[PDB]
Symmetry: C3
Subunit: 230 residues, 3 copies
């Protein structure tokens, strides 16, 4: 409790933990192989996020980075989380639309570049260079958002109506929430330092819970996750 | 030789090295694509374990973690090994029974959470919190063991008799040997410190060789790894 | 500019950056799913290499390792690059010949062992032991080259002529360029220290650009990357 951001970390932990348990319970019983894929991916996302929120809460996922003449507290565990959870979120979207394997590789690959360069920016000791990594990461993000809107063209023809409507809602959720992440980082403790760490942590907790648990609720309540069957 | 556990590390290295070479030689010649998968996975497991045993032997895979007021020697390389070898062992089991892809994702994902939280517990400097990570890791392990017993139901109907009988033996080996790992960690150098590092290393070497080389011998001697063919 | 090797790092960065943009532009428009796979993989390789060249250029990807009584500047970011880019290059080759999944696992697995042991050797503080890791890594490399020449036998029968001819050229490029890497490391700053870091960096930049951008140009200009279609 010695760090004012503790409360949001605690709340993040709880909410990811409850979402994990809810999805685990919800997917008990499902037999449809397509649904099984979506439950697995979607349950793992908040399970991973639970562990990394806990790690931040306990202090393990925090480090001090010198830059601007100071020791800046940097929560590195967020990158360990997103390294796995963001390709998993993309896979859910990808599977929904039956994406080509080349498209899934491009998405997962650009996403790893996004998170890996954000991690490098987060740990960089030359203040100005932190923003170069931020720009490159942001370019990888723009690429991903591009592909999510303009890369699933040949799939329109043969998309069930429910699949298309759940994909569009999840795609919109994804595009609005993920785009806030470079902005928060840029104004927050990792960037310009205009928004204090405690508010930054609040923002990230609200975005993370929405993009993971919120996203998963929408998905796992849709019939789009089942094969079409009599 | 300055650390009494050196001998078990040396023996571990040798045994993983010999098992690797045996499996490499044994799979030379195989053409059946299904068998090829099982040889690959099964040869990589002890090859990876060889490198990480060597790293412990040479001192590279050892670190000192402060906790309980002391510098505790923690072999971190075990987590680098298991991070890859335990999903590979699970994949062998998964492929045997033709598991659904959602099931394989759940297994590999829970296994990464098991090893990643064990690594966090192993490196945590607040003694009491080490056991929180141990509990979470152990919960992920229980999940995996659950899935291995109750998640391959729809597959019974259409399982060749030899596949079912090799899977059950390998599943039993897996469940008994993997369950010892949280116990050894808990009583050993990473946990309560009741069993000294040198005996802890002996235990881990005996379990690892059995679960990897022992497991692989059973598997690679079965006809369950070949497609059914005239 | 304080390190004489800066210029090759800068040039490496530029060339990987331009190759990335060229391949991105070149693959815009492609619809053939098989081609899409090859573009994705092949565009990601220099994109990843761009980020890690930049990281070396900026100083983030450099560390000092004590050995031989000295602080040796070791560029660790090369291993972060190759950890992903070399399995991706192998996948391009693998997909060309429609390799069995067991073969792809063996290749990707041996490649991870190659890079992971090279990383361990690069960071090892006992000078003599660095070369043990070099030998093990080199053995994994020889295995890969073996598989690339003698592991795609059953595939000859049913290989389009263009696929076979592009695969052979790319396989030859791969075998000559990758084999230089253990030699450069062995004589360079990570090994015997016979070739200074600045020339070592030049060598690695010339090899990397050739094996990634050079390789990708050959591939992406071939018709072997398209499904056979009327
Ligand atoms: C059996 C397994 C699945 C794992 C069990 C471990 C466990 C759920 C995590 C412990 C959390 C935590 C209180 C750590 C101790 C902190 C001190 C104060 C303080 C609030 C933080 C909480 C973690 C919030 C609740 C989480 C849910 C019950 C889910
Ligand atoms: C956390 C616990 C509930 C686990 C311990 C329980 C043990 C065994 C008993 C539970 C068991 C009956 C599970 C029942 C569900 C059934 C199958 C579950 O999962 C379905 C699928 C695909 O359909 O993937 C879904 C993929 C999922 C992946 C599993 C990851 C989990 C592992 C533990 C850590 C997490 C964090 C949650 C903590 C909170 C508190
Ligand atoms: C390594 C992953 C690469 C693979 C890409 C191939 O694409 C296939 C799909 C589904 O068809 O899943 C592939 C995507 C899946 C995503 C789940 C986890 C991912 C992690 C990617 C980066 C990590 C790096 C390792 C540390
Ligand atoms: C050509 C490649 C496949 C790799 C070659 C490298 C090699 C096999 C590893 C060297 C091991 C080791 C003796 C390191 C030096 C330690 C000193 C004492 C001491 C006992 C440890 C051993 C490693 C045990 C034998 C291993 C097998 C021969 C397999
Ligand atoms: C260690 C050495 C024997 C390698 C160096 C040799 C070189 C080339 C000559 C050997 C060569 C003729 C291999 C013959 C086998 C053939 C195909 C081999 O593998 C079969 C499959 C799928 O069926 O995957 C199987 C997957 C396997 C993965 C390969 C990993 C290995 C790489 C080296 C490090 C290891 C550690 C073992 C050290 C001991 C001593
Ligand atoms: C990344 C891996 C995720 C993938 C999951 C999809 O499942 C597919 C199967 C077989 O059909 O193989 C997938 C499982 C394979 C296992 C081999 C290695 C694994 C490693 C997983 C975690 C690592 C994290 C990176 C560091
Ligand atoms: C919008 C995104 C795709 C990412 C934008 C960021 C950007 C391309 C990288 C900046 C590089 C660099 C000059 C960093 C600053 C160094 C100082 C001197 C000095 C030479 C190094 C260069 C990076 C070479 C040119 C690269 C290409 C234009 C491609
Ligand atoms: C670097 C930028 C051009 C990205 C920012 C742009 C944004 C959106 C606008 C560009 C957009 C119209 C892309 C057009 C191409 C179309 C589809 C692209 O890709 C095709 C495939 C499979 O066929 O995979 C190909 C796989 C590829 C993977 C994407 C990785 C990239 C991400 C950014 C960092 C890199 C480094 C290059 C820097 C130079 C300077
Ligand atoms: C983890 C990857 C394991 C997988 C292996 C299965 O093989 C399937 C193929 C194509 O059919 O792609 C698999 C190969 C793909 C390669 C792209 C990235 C790879 C990375 C492998 C090691 C990394 C370790 C994590 C840090
Ligand atoms: C958020 C992100 C940026 C992360 C993206 C990926 C990322 C984790 C990249 C990592 C590369 C790298 C470790 C960088 C090192 C930085 C540093 C200064 C040093 C590290 O940190 C330390 C310092 O003490 C130890 O590293 C050396 C040991 C290794 C970390 C582990 C070695 C593993 C291998 C030798 C065994 C072989 C593994 C494979 C066979 C796996 C293949 C899968 C298959 C079987 C299917
Ligand atoms: C046993 C376990 C817990 C491990 C489970 C996974 C684990 C390795 C998670 C790692 C996340 C993370 C690095 C945590 C950092 C902790 C620390 C304090 C800092 C690190 O350690 C150091 C400190 O000096 C360096 O890190 C920063 C650089 C990176 C490690 C590497 C960057 C890679 C990228 C920028 C390039 C893009 C890669 C992708 C394109 C890959 C996608 C595959 C595709 C092409 C198919
Ligand atoms: C070039 C190479 C050698 C690299 C090859 C692979 C390599 C990166 C191996 C890494 C293992 C390991 C971290 C070694 C540690 C060395 C060191 C001394 C300590 C580390 O470095 C630091 C020190 O401060 C932090 O580590 C601990 C935290 C972890 C790094 C991250 C934890 C992740 C998890 C707890 C969450 C679960 C993840 C999975 C669910 C992913 C599964 C995918 C799925 C969902 C499909
Ligand atoms: C799991 C929850 C979400 C939505 C995760 C998203 C992570 C990103 C979209 C990260 C983006 C970054 C960019 C684009 C620029 C650098 C800093 C980040 C790594 C935060
Ligand atoms: C390769 C050999 C085997 C059987 C590896 C197994 C590793 C585990 C089952 C690890 C389990 C752990 C748990 C469940 C609790 C924390 C400590 C561990 C990481 C050792
Ligand atoms: C991306 C460009 C290329 C060709 C990368 C290749 C990397 C290798 C072939 C690395 C080999 C190593 C060996 C075999 C021995 C130890 C040192 C290395 C890691 C450099």
């Amino acid at each position: 409790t010695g760090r004012p951001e503790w409360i949001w970390l605690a709340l993040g932990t709880a909410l990811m933990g409850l979402g994990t348990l809810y999805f685990l319970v919800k997917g008990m019983g499902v037999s449809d192989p397509d649904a099984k894929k979506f439950y697995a991916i979607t349950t793992l996302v908040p399970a991973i996020a639970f562990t990394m929120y806990l790690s931040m809460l306990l202090g393990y996922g925090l480090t001090m980075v010198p830059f601007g003449g100071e020791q800046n507290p940097i929560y590195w565990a967020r990158y360990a989380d997103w390294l796995f959870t963001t390709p998993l979120l993309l896979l859910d979207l990808a599977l929904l639309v039956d994406a080509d394997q080349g498209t899934i590789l491009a998405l997962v690959g650009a996403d790893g570049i996004m998170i890996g360069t954000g991690l490098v920016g987060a740990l960089t000791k030359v203040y100005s260079y932190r923003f170069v990594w931020w720009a490159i990461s942001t370019a990888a993000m723009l690429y991903i958002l591009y592909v999510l809107f303009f890369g699933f063209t040949s799939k329109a023809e043969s998309m069930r109506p429910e699949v298309a409507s759940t994909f569009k809602v999840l795609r919109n959720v994804t595009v609005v929430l993920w785009s806030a992440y470079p902005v928060v980082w840029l104004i927050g403790s990792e960037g310009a330092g205009i928004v204090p760490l405690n508010i930054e942590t609040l923002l990230f907790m609200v975005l993370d819970v929405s993009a993971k648990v919120g996203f998963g609720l929408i998905l796992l309540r849709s019939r789009a996750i089942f094969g079409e069957a009599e």
